[PDB]
């Protein structure tokens, strides 16, 4: 299982962000709004292949969560689809980036603004987000935003769609890696 693949909770479907680790403990990052209220995650819609259990969640304000792998057999690739990921970097305005999600697959575009505030309503406000012109649609939450071999962000939310064009906001991944003391591999 790698970045962009579907992940299922008790309520719905998100995408795996990045596989990460601390020493010998393997985890995956995803969106905070996916891990909020979620306990167990599975790799299929039938909920027959376990992935692991939520270890942390930060949403709203931020939008990142982390799941601890409990599955011993499943391969935990340090990639996004076939793509190698070797470091984490900060987004910059003008940076060409790529997103992978479980609904839309892979889409590319550029960072158009940093530190954006996104108000999802009901008091669910997120701050410090990366704005891009890449599309995304439901199911794509938590998927990776990368640039060549660099990990940049996790999909949070957006407007529009892949057919007409959209705007998508991502949580900077460096903030998550620091919060949990984990690293990409």
């Amino acid at each position: 299982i790698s970045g962009g693949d579907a992940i299922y909770s008790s309520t719905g479907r998100c995408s795996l962000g990045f596989n990460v680790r601390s020493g010998s403990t393997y985890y995956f990052l995803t969106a905070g709004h996916c891990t909020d209220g979620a306990t167990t995650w599975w790799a299929n819609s039938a909920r027959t292949t376990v992935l692991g259990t939520t270890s942390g969640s930060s949403f709203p304000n931020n939008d990142y969560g982390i799941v601890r792998y409990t599955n011993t057999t499943i391969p935990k690739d340090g990639t996004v689809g076939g793509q190698d990921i070797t470091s984490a970097a900060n987004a910059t305005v003008g940076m060409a980036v790529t997103r992978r999600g479980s609904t839309t697959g892979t889409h590319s575009g550029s960072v158009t603004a940093l530190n954006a505030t996104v108000n999802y309503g009901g008091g669910d406000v997120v701050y410090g987000m990366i704005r891009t012109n890449v599309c995304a649609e439901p199911g794509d939450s938590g998927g990776p935003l990368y640039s060549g071999t660099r990990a940049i962000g996790l999909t949070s939310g957006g407007s529009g769609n892949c057919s007409s064009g959209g705007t998508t906001f991502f949580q900077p991944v460096t903030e998550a890696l620091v919060a949990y003391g984990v690293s990409v591999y």
């Binding site: 999802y120 309503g121 794509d140």
Partner: protein, 50 residues
């Protein structure tokens, strides 16, 4: 209840709803945005995929 809409953006978890237009809407925020866009013409057929 799409009273709190429209919204400039939606989170993107998948929890489907089926519109009266026979389109599966990926989540309630996407569905309510489409109701607004339709000027209240679109309605919910049932929960889950169409």
């Amino acid at each position: 209840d799409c009273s709190e809409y429209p919204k400039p953006a939606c989170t993107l978890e998948y929890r489907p709803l089926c519109g009266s237009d026979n389109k599966t809407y990926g989540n309630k925020c996407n569905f309510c945005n489409a109701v607004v866009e339709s000027n209240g013409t679109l309605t919910l057929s049932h929960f889950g995929k169409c």
